[PDB]
Every structure is written in structure tokens, then in C-alpha cells.
Design a binder for this molecule. Structure first.
Ligand SMILES: CCCCCCCO[C@H]1O[C@H](CO)[C@@H](O)[C@H](O)[C@@H]1O
Ligand SMILES: C[As](C)(=O)[O-]
Lengths: 279, 14
């Protein structure tokens, strides 16, 4: 019994350790969010299938690493879901062929937010998985340890919903004018979803975001967001109603708005946060 | 925040 990764990295008979670099494409699913499917990354085979039956489990202690380490979740092992990090050894999966077959492990994260996310830097550790191999032949009891690393920069969604983009830049027409903000949201299943804006505002009504352009700034204007004409102030929750698998546009438009005094030539910039909530 | 919007614009004199 031995195993290898998609890139050919091997752990031989008797167990050992290997680093597994994976391209992540996390996604929200119903009641759990996919972090990574390793069934395309890690493979094992039985070296003497005529004589011996090999048994493989996911051993307790298997857990997330890095920024994900505080997150509870589930692991799908050969189709069935089990708590993650593993606090008890999974059932055994039989290996009975010299042909390399997948180690059927997929890691999920339990939603703790509405549409939040956590940034994963490329090259960082995301999980350590302990594969335990036994058999019906002798008392062989071998540990194959897989250190799972992100091969790319992604953000893992931590909520029941996800967004079209985590960072959006729009460019207003030269003053005066407005521009649509492309921003949509969807949920794995129906959620009663709302959102609120956050940022530095210039007015009493907390509805005009300050111009913070550092170089050659204009005077007398800020940025004001509207939703089909309705002014959206900061820290005021807007309801999107029920949001399901079909993307829903937040319907936001950016505008210039007078903040007081002579309007002067120069650059305009406002940074505005969007945070989703359940209702 | 879950999302960060950057709004750029400019005032041109005339
Ligand atoms: C027909 C007699 C073959 C006996 C040779 C021992 C082979 O043992 C290796 O291969 C076995 C089969 O994969 C494993 O069960 C065992 O743990 C180890 O990896
Ligand atoms: C608003 As202006 C700088 O064209 O007077």
C-alpha cells in the first residue's frame, strides 16, 4: 500500500508525509461551504490485492491549519459527512486494486456569517490530514500525513451567501454624474438577506461619503449611493428580501453629492464597505 | 466589511 499526489509526490509503503499544493475554488453549498476537494489530489493503491485487503480511515486529529484552524466544519469521506476537525476515526474504506484510486476526502466549513469570507494567501497551510492504513494480513498500522497548502489566493466564504466580487471599483463620469455599481449576491438556499454600508461620511444624515482622494483632491463634493433613487445612508440596513440561488443585484448607483462650499477641480475618491446580515 | 467598493471620480474645471 502506497499513495501519491496529482503532481506525482509519493508516500511509500510504511507511511510518511507529503505536501499537497492545491488550486482552491471554494463555494457555498447548502448548510456547508466547500473549502477543498482532495479526491482529485490524493490517490492510493493496494500492492497485493489478490492476497490482502487494505483498510483506510481518516484519523482523529485531522484538522484545518492557518487562518481556517478556528473554523468548525465537516468532511465528506467516500460520500458520507463527518465532523471536522475529526474527533473520532472515520469508517474504513477498502482498497483492493493496484490501480491508483482517489482518497475520497472533501473539506467543508460550517457557515458562521451571512456573506462573510476569510482570505487565503497562496502558499499557506489550510489543513493537515492523517490517513491511517491497516489491513487483514498482519498488524501493519501506517500513518500517511498530508499537509494541504493553498496554491493560489482565494477567499473562502464563511456564510450562507456569496457575492459577485469582494472588491469593486467604479469610475464616475466627470462631475456631475452617476455610475451603476455592479454588485450581486446569492445564497445556497433561501435567506432573508439585508446589508448596510460603512465608511466616513461628511453630512449630518450620514449619507454622503467623504472625498478621501489623497492627491489633488476636489473640494465640496462627496460620494452618495442610491438604490433606484433612494439614498442609502451608512449603518442603515437595507432589505433584499428572500435571496436564493439566483443572483440578486443590490441595485446600487454611485453619485456625486455636494458637501458644502465651493466645488473645486480635483480627484474624488470614497471607500465604502458593504456588510450583509440575516433578517 | 464583506465587500469594499472604491468610487473614483474627478471634477474638471471649465
Ligand atoms: C503476497 C504476499 C505479499 C505480502 C507483502 C507485504 C506487503 O505489504 C505492503 O502492502 C500491503 C498491501 O497493500 C499492505 O497491506 C502493507 O501494509 C504494506 O504496505
Ligand atoms: C463645478 As466647476 C469646478 O465646473 O465650477
Amino acid at each position: 500500500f502506497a499513495c501519491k499526489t496529482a503532481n506525482g509526490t509519493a508516500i511509500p509503503i510504511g507511511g510518511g508525509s507529503a505536501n499537497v499544493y492545491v488550486n482552491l475554488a471554494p463555494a457555498v453549498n447548502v448548510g456547508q461551504n466547500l473549502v477543498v476537494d482532495l479526491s482529485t489530489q490524493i490517490f492510493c493503491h493496494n500492492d497485493y490485492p489478490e492476497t490482502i485487503t487494505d483498510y483506510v480511515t481518516l484519523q482523529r486529529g485531522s484538522a484545518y491549519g492557518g487562518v481556517l484552524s478556528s473554523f468548525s466544519g465537516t468532511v465528506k469521506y467516500n460520500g458520507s459527512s463527518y465532523p471536522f476537525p475529526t474527533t473520532s476515526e472515520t469508517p474504513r474504506v477498502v482498497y483492493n486494486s493496484r490501480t491508483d484510486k482517489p482518497w475520497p476526502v472533501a473539506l467543508y466549513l460550517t457557515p458562521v456569517s451571512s456573506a462573510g469570507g476569510v482570505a487565503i494567501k497562496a502558499g499557506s497551510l489550510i489543513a493537515v490530514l492523517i490517513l491511517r492504513q491497516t489491513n487483514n494480513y498482519n498488524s501493519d498500522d501506517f500513518q500517511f500525513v498530508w499537509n494541504i497548502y493553498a496554491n493560489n489566493d482565494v477567499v473562502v466564504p464563511t456564510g450562507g451567501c456569496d457575492v459577485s466580487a469582494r472588491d469593486v471599483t467604479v469610475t464616475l463620469p466627470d462631475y456631475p454624474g452617476s455610475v451603476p455599481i455592479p454588485l450581486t449576491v446569492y445564497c445556497a438556499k433561501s435567506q432573508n438577506l439585508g446589508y448596510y454600508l460603512s465608511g466616513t461620511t461628511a453630512d449630518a444624515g450620514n449619507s454622503i461619503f467623504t472625498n478621501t482622494a489623497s492627491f489633488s483632491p476636489a473640494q465640496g463634493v462627496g460620494v452618495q449611493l442610491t438604490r433606484n433613487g433612494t439614498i442609502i445612508p451608512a449603518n442603515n440596513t437595507v432589505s433584499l428580501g428572500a435571496v436564493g440561488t439566483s443572483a440578486v443585484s443590490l441595485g446600487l448607483t454611485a453619485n456625486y453629492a455636494r458637501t458644502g462650499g465651493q466645488v473645486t477641480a480635483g480627484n474624488v475618491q470614497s471607500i465604502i464597505g458593504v456588510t450583509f446580515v440575516y433578517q | 466589511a464583506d465587500v469594499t467598493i472604491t468610487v473614483n471620480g474627478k471634477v474638471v474645471a471649465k
